[PDB]
């Protein structure tokens with residue numbers, strides 16, 4: 285019997301099998317009545333779908349059917365940890381799950397919600413099907429890297445290195461950059477489904493590929509979106525949020541900056557987190573009324 289990396293049989297859990305024959309763990313939050321819309325939640329690098337419990341329960345409370353899976357190599361899904369043959373695998377698998385849910389709920393609008401690497405996934409998904417999605421909620425999406433982190437010289441060394449030792453690790457993540465909320469950093473550091481190990485250079489190359497692909501996608505992007513960004517984000521540089529606002533073709537685009545906030549805005553200081561929830565609630569409510 286096929287089992288999650290934590291040894292739980294997939295037959296006990298919601299799942300799907302992707303185009304490469306890998307089992308992905310799925311999560312669903314369905315209202316009691318006919319939903320008004322569908323929304324897919326796209327998690328970030330090293331995390332998993334269970335970190336969106338509270339946001340998902342809020343969206344289900346608006347009578348959306350919320351659904352997610354753990355990306356390949358993440359959470360309770362199969363695959364070598366935090367490795368992907370090419371970044372587009374994540375997009376492909378999102379589209380499989382979206383197409384499965386649309387078949388079951390024909391005619392309902394479908395939204396995307398993406399954070400971090402999952403925001404880059406959401407952008408690329410929406411740019412692959414222009415006109416298809418009703419809207420996107422992006423929380424600190426990967427659009428631009430921290431310019432210090434990703435100099436021409438560090439990127440050219442990292443391509444040379446990846447041609448020899450694609451499995452070489454960077455250091456562990458500084459989880460202290462994720463949030464000013466120390467209890468949320470402690471929760472992240474003790475979550476057995478998070479990968480906080482070094483990133484492999486081959487996966488760092490796939491994140492640079494995502495950044496490249498997002499830039500080429502922005503002039504195709506027409507989908508309505510809400511963009512939430514902290515000013516003190518050391519992973520997804522705030523300059524990327526400005527770039528997405530400038531280059532997207534979307535007629536309906538809104539940015540809110542959280543002054544002083546770190547990366548995980550939905551698990552930040554309580555004033556930030558409460559604002560993030562409220563803004564998502566109003567933006568989705570307006571567009572499902």
Ligand SMILES: CCC(F)(F)C(=O)C[S@@](=O)c1ccc(C(=O)N2CCN(c3cccc(Cl)c3)[C@@H](C)[C@@H]2C)cc1Cl
Pocket residue numbers: 327328329330331399400401402425426429430433434435438439442443483485487488489491492518519520547
């Ligand atoms: C919890 C959710 C989440 F994890 F926060 C996200 O999904 C964040 S994910 O979008 C992400 C974004 C940026 C970085 C990061 O600091 N860098 C800078 C250095 N980069 C780089 C530099 C030289 C060479 C190479 Cl090969 C790569 C990449 C590793 C990447 C662009 C790291 C990550 Cl993990």
